[PDB]
Design a protein around this ligand. Structure first.
Ligand code: CL
Ligand code: K
Length: 663
């Protein structure tokens, strides 16, 4: 039976600038929730509750990996430096968490350092973010005088007598602080009642609000992402850390308190599947980290959303379309490793030595096909060539690439030993290359990024392709007439067989189609794949011995070559959907920048004190976008970018592309 109920489970991340003390706060949480008074996830406990502490990345930019982490954790502790409150880095991350429906409590850390100011720090939540945040605590003293904390919910006071976290004394609220405490409690009830009609009716109706009534309302508002409790302390000198952990229990969600994860069936990507926490339901879990341990070998960390799985059983890796035997399962505690037999909905563990299961893969039952992570457009849009410095550097590169694919499912690599890497954007490529060079000690030269262009035809033509040769021992013969016509943008390749009366024998018709496919891949105008073209085979000739599958592949090739002279080919470029969220005062510079990159806007909508812009920008004009965005928003804006459609390149730009590719 499960040790801890669904209701008594807390999946949390810590969100903090390195300057706000993320690592000390993280060390203290691990100490207090451990047994004795770095892991992708630590299994821990507090007050009869399972607490799983999930590592969150330090990215200044929103990556596929940041998004994965928001989907694995359920709640977070946002840590601020008492001297400066919310900084730009803190703000971008906060806006991303709101989009993913993640409840937060705020911990104002460093209350003992020079310049500490609880009231100012709380005011930055209001001004920078328009967040409905209110103190549930008040500090007594600041800097070297920080000495006590008032719990405003219970109306009790806790005094600290040392820097170790022991011998805490409960005292009466000091006389000179009672008015200020009563005032803050009233402010706390008002901010919560803005989200609750029934509470507001009680408050205005001059009724008393019990402790249990107030906690319940705070929890409801918090787990609905309509309210943010604000707490205070100092992690390094152990004051307020135990009260912060009690607040994780009191106010942060169980796996049932947040929106369920959304996936689809492998057999039908348009059919939606909701995976809610339910031990009797079908199993579904998502892999989110892969570690290689010197003793146990490969560790794949996963979060279970629904159902249960037992060690020694077979599951489906639905992303690969392959079965996996789950041989052994580990939970990593602060001071020990623990082997377990079963993992339940809401739980996190690591599977030991999976053959073919990496980060971002879905596991489900053998009989089922739910997928929880994918991209609508999986293909790379930008590529880079990488040249190893030597044999030793070549060998290292081969190893690096295998390990990098386990960690990031969104890049592709093809390896003569020149390697071409394909990815989703300039930052993505830079992160991978950095990891190769620094972490796997590979010495290499890297080329300029190359956007993934395509070609298409703008007009139609009939052409003959005829192949007649005897080199060298006997003749090969193939003869086709084909009509080429442009297809709809996005509709792809379509081959039509209009041969009647066997003028081209049925056994060589698939060869005409396959020959056209292969030739189109090489492009006609600047070396990029030709797409969105229709081709109809309607006449030709043959001989009963001299014709061959091969002869007709070549005949079809010569026909495309003739058609490229007559069908007005053009270069197409990838157009990205660029979604920009920034404080509203930066509209002017954000929109001017979109215009300067040949982009356009289709809809912009307010969200809090922000605007959300739907823009379309050519990928070739997105180099340096994150830098300009950081500069135009004082570090406070964030964005995502995905492939959207192909568009024709302007005439003078295409001429540059052809001039350059001809050297
Ligand atoms: Cl405490
Ligand atoms: K767990």
């Amino acid at each position: 039976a499960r040790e801890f109920s669904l209701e008594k489970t807390r999946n949390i991340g810590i969100m903090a600038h390195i300057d706000a003390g993320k690592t000390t706060t993280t060390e203290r949480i691990l100490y207090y929730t451990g047994r004795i008074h770095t892991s992708a996830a630590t299994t821990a406990a507090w007050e009869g509750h399972r607490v799983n502490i999930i590592d969150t990345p330090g990215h200044v930019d929103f990556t596929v990996e940041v998004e994965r982490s928001l989907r694995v954790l359920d709640g977070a502790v946002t840590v601020l430096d008492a001297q400066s409150g919310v900084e730009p880095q803190t703000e971008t991350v906060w806006r991303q968490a709101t989009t993913y429906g993640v409840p937060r409590i705020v911990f104002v850390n460093k209350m003992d350092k020079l310049g500490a100011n609880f009231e100012y720090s709380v005011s930055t939540l209001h001004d920078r973010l328009q967040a409905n945040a209110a103190p549930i605590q008040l500090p007594i003293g600041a800097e070297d005088e920080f000495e006590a904390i008032i719990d405003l919910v219970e109306m009790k006071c806790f005094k600290y007598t040392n820097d170790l976290g022991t011998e805490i004394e409960e005292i009466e609220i000091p006389e000179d602080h009672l008015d200020r405490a009563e005032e803050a409690r009233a402010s706390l009830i008002e901010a919560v009642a803005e989200t609750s009609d029934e509470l507001m009716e009680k408050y205005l109706g001059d009724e008393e609000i019990s402790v249990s009534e107030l906690k319940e309302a705070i929890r409801q508002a918090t787990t609905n992402v309509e309210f943010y409790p604000v707490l205070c302390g100092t992690a390094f000198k152990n004051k307020g850390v135990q009260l912060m952990l009690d607040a994780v229990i009191d106010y942060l969600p169980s796996p049932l308190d947040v929106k369920p994860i959304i996936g689809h069936r492998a057999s039908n990507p348009e059919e939606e599947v909701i995976a809610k926490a339910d031990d009797s339901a079908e199993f579904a879990a998502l892999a989110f980290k892969v570690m290689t341990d010197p003793y146990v070998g490969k560790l794949t960390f996963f979060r279970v959303y629904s159902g249960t799985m037992t060690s020694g059983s077979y599951v489906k890796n639905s992303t690969k379309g392959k079965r996996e035997r789950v041989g052994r399962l580990l939970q990593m505690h602060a001071n020990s490793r623990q082997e377990i037999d079963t993992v339940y909905s809401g739980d996190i563990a690591a599977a030991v030595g999976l053959k073919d299961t990496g980060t971002g893969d879905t596991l489900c039952g053998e009989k089922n096909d739910i997928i929880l992570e994918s991209m609508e457009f999986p293909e790379p849009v930008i590529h880079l060539s990488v040249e190893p410095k030597s044999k030793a550097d070549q060998d290292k590169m081969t190893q690096a690439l295998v390990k990098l694919q386990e960690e990031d499912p969104t890049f592709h690599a093809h390896t003569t030993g020149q390697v071409i890497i394909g990815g989703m954007g300039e930052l993505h490529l830079d992160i991978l290359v950095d990891r190769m060079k620094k972490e796997f000690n590979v010495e290499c030269n890297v080329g300029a990024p190359m956007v993934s262009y395509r070609e298409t035809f703008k007009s139609s033509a009939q052409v003959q392709g005829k192949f007649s040769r005897q080199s060298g021992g006997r003749g090969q013969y193939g003869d086709v007439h084909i009509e080429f016509t442009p297809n709809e943008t996005g509709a792809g390749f379509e081959f039509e067989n209009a041969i009647v009366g066997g003028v081209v024998p049925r056994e060589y018709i698939p060869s005409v189609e396959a020959g056209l496919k292969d030739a189109m891949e090489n492009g006609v105008l600047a070396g990029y794949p030709l797409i969105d073209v229709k081709a109809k085979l309607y006449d030709g000739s043959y001989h009963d011995v001299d014709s061959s599958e091969m002869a007709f592949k070549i005949a079809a090739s010569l026909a495309l070559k003739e058609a490229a002279k007559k069908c007005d080919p053009v270069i197409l470029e990838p157009m990205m959907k660029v979604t920009i969220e920034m404080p509203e005062e930066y509209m002017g510079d954000i929109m001017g920048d979109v215009t300067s990159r040949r982009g356009r806007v289709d809809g912009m909508e307010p969200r809090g004190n922000a605007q959300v812009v739907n823009a379309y920008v050519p990928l070739s004009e997105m180099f340096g976008y994150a830098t300009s965005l950081r500069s135009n928003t004082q570090g406070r804006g964030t964005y995502t970018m995905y492939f959207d459609h192909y568009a024709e390149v302007p005439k003078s730009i295409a001429e540059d592309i052809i001039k350059k590719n001809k050297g």
